[PDB]
Write a protein that binds this ligand. Structure first.
Ligand SMILES: CCCCCCCCCCCCCCCCCCCC
Ligand SMILES: CCCCCCCCCCCCCCCCCCCC
Ligand SMILES: CCCCCCCCCCCCCCCCCCCC
Ligand SMILES: CCCCCCCCCCCCCCCCCCCC
Lengths: 164, 164, 164, 164, 164, 164, 164, 164
């Protein structure tokens, strides 16, 4: 039987679907970067998409580990066009900060219900978000300093294209 | 500029989205199997899901390689329950046969427009489908030997759960 | 069930049987070369016999992979004597060319039925047939040059006796 | 010239062709096992078929080594269907026993003609036959113990499917 | 004897000479890049020239494999100048597309004559062209955004100058 | 700017083109040997063609090194047939000596203009020509002794066929 | 079922019991040497008893391989005293010769019944007996040269005591 | 001279003969299991038979070490059949417990005579008997859990056949 409340299971399941949309969003950003001829940015986004899927499966397993069941929901069509390089990364940061707040909402719900296990389990994602947001903020600061110069952008694209 | 016709690009892009759904459908089959207590069939479906993504990404890279662009579409909600294992795998088989025929449709279209590059590129998928379909027919035939015996179905669960 | 037509399965199965006779024929050629004291040429024919068997088995597995079944047919008695080294290889070439045309007939059949999986599958045999025919024409060219001089013929026998 | 009587040469040549039929019969049994979804048993049979061919070639070489010649004969169509796994293996055993007696008939003929060379050469086959019969009897015994339990039969299949 | 039709032999032989000119053109572009002091771009073109030679020799060998003969034709003087780096690459792309169409024309001819062996052999060149056109297109798009900036042009030179 | 006179530049560029024709002529000789079934002699000729290209590239680099530019010229159609092995190698020797005299001409021209750097650069080609001529004379001597005896020709062909 | 006649099985089973007695007999010789203070001789005899058991177990396994059954019979009390070292070894030799003849009798019976498998199987014991008798004769000859001299017997004892 | 009493020597010498019979009895149990198709249980008994012999030999050596002599007695015919598996092992246990008591009798006898060396020497055997009885009881316990399930009985057979 489930050892988590139906409320927490729902919250986790929806976060699972939320992570899947995140991954699909970043893939969409990759289709945009590839369209604009920036293989390095595209590459970074494909990796970011992959990392997001692992996050989703990490929620997947926990849900079953507590007797819960995962229900895959419809995934919405993501945007495919951005004004430019910086805008796409800006949207990536805004999206990360959104998933971080989504994580926060589950943590507060689990905390209110004294579901200490789930609260402990979420700690990892909190720390991971602080890391992802910082990555994007760095890229943005760099793009901001680049101020449109194709020379710096090309470097940035080459570097980000190195992400393992 | 695109060197593939708009008709072929569209056929390729829709197949790309179709692969993503196939992956999602298999993940959903996995949620069904995990909920029913069959980890083995679950593990297999997950692996089958990742394989379908690598397929989608091949369509992805080729579309760009031909000067086109990828556009990600909305992914409909997949079924989350089946009337038993056999019913599940049969839906899986039925689905693969459907993607195979989809693949066949692009190939005839490309062939008709004398787009030899796309016709040749599709060859790899035709061969994969032959392999994927055969693995499901195998499983279905093995389940058939179980003839309801659960102790046997559990043995097939432990085997499929060995997939690398 | 069978995802290949009865017509196609028959064409495959009959080709499989044809490949087995081919193997037996090359073995027979080996019995002739060994009786004439040419161990090297015999060795070559034995290697060629095994090759053809691997071809047979390739058709064998594909047939089952497409839900078909293989039925082994009676193998006719192959010739056991030839009018000299040249005559033997000439017969071998003639047979190889017959096998290729056979391969061709199955391909056009599958193509007419839009059985792309099978058309694709046959490509490998088409390329192998090109390689096999060429090996025999080279041998026949060298024999033509040898013009019956035991001196060079011994060399040919030695070289061919090196085939792995 | 031949240093074996024409009688012994004929008996050796007929045994060679008899080994080839054995090899073919075992392949036919493989067609049946594969048709029945038992890859493993089919594998064991494909290996058995190959082993039989090495035995035929061992008769082949001896014949030439005694100055004889080999003449390949037609190969009759073998049976392609059995009433279950146990029935196929029983027919295999029965076939083995038949080849064992075949080897005895030659041994006795050679011994009658005082062909000590050929008698000694046959010694190897007598010993091998004892081992080949034991193997099949061992398998039959495992099948009898399985007593229709698809569970253990699944294990047997996978086991025999490992034959090197 | 020739097993390919005279029409196909002629098409192949003409394509071999076409690949040779292609090699020579790319070398000519190297003469231009070196005259403009771009070692990296020149290097890339020298490597491309070699790649084309290997293609010509694959046609050479296939012609002999089908019993045909190669006849080398005169090679026309290629252009030795272009209006800047980008212009040279536009010319390269347009030339790569011409080669692809040339390959297409042979494929269709062979296909119409039912020369399956030749249609199959050409598949490799269809796939290689897709890859060659893509490299050039990628380079052109990068130069397009470079808009003549000497900074990025130097980055491109070095990068391309690494081609192995 | 150019530090070599236009006259010397012309002579070096024309020699570069001459080397390319040599390369092409040796390939042509290869098409003749392959057509006659002497793969070894064909191989040797293909290796000789490659060696001639490296020489062309030597001239190429020196021209740029002295501030000149290379201009690829049309390459004429070479003969494609000879009256036999001996005849072909003889035509090869005669061509090599033609190349040597050509090298002599540039050398005398550079020496008259006191272009010591070019005179010095040409020394390497004068010594290489000594080696090239000798290799063909050596082959011609063996063919002379062979006097048609296919027995030694085969050996000569396999030997030359081993050139690296 | 049994593939050996009841008469052969009987002969084999009885030989097994016979081998077991030999073992017991040699152990008894060990009890005599030990009592006489010759640990080395005792050691050799204990190893000999072990060898005899391994021989008995060879008959054991062969009997079941041919569908037979082993029935252990009573073991008679062996002598426990001898008139000296030499006497003990003469008795062992005489016993060995007895088993050799016993093997001979079974061999002859098997041969008469045309049971080639059993004849072949007994070959190993024929050769083994020749070697065993030889070891005992070798010891007897060393005891002869010894000529009652304790000095030499001490060495012989310590020596035979090294048998592994 | 004998430093052990004739009473203790006889009890030790009789125990040695008892251990040999125990060995033979367990071999007989193995003849029964093999006859019934259980190789595992037969394997087990074979190992048990060998273990008992080492016990015998330990008694053997100790007897000499105390200046006594060993006299091998006639060994009786052991039972060759049992009313099923359980019946055999139960007899085995009964026999184990019997040799245990026999050991106790010698121990109490030696103790009564103040033969401390013999009392100490027997300790090892008391401990080994505990180990052996426990093994047989565990086997019987598992046979009970098998509850006539031939399927399970074969599983145990395979387990005991792994004894080292
Ligand atoms: C590098 C390209 C990565 C593209 C990722 C695209 C993701 C699209 C979202 C759809 C969900 C797919 C389901 C996949 C589940 C995989 C589970 C693996 C478990 C080990
Ligand atoms: C060392 C030389 C080897 C010669 C091999 C000759 C084979 C001739 C084929 C005769 C046809 C008999 C059927 C054989 C079926 C073998 C199936 C193998 C399946 C793995
Ligand atoms: C390093 C720069 C490469 C320059 C290639 C220039 C090619 C010019 C075309 C002229 C024809 C030359 C003949 C080449 C024959 C090669 C044969 C290889 C056989 C394995
Ligand atoms: C270490 C010294 C060896 C002494 C051997 C004495 C043998 C006496 C014969 C009595 C028979 C006992 C039964 C032995 C069965 C052995 C089975 C082995 C199976 C691998």
């Amino acid at each position: 039987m489930m050892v988590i409340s139906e409320k927490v299971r729902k919250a986790l399941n929806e976060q699972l679907n939320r992570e899947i949309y995140s991954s699909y969003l970043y893939l969409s950003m990759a289709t945009y970067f590839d369209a604009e001829g920036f293989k390095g940015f595209a590459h970074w986004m494909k990796k970011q998409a992959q990392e997001e899927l692992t996050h989703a499966m990490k929620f997947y397993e926990y849900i079953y580990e507590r007797g819960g069941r995962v229900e895959l929901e419809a995934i919405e069509k993501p945007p495919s066009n951005w004004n430019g390089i910086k805008d796409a990364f800006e949207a990536a940061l805004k999206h990360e900060e959104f998933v971080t707040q989504s994580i926060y909402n589950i943590l507060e719900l689990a905390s209110e219900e004294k579901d200490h296990a789930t609260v402990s389990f979420l700690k990892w994602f909190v720390d991971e978000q602080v890391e992802e947001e910082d990555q994007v903020r760095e890229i943005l600061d760099l793009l901001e300093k680049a101020n449109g110069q194709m020379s710096v952008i090309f470097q940035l694209d080459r570097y980000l294209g190195q992400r393992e």
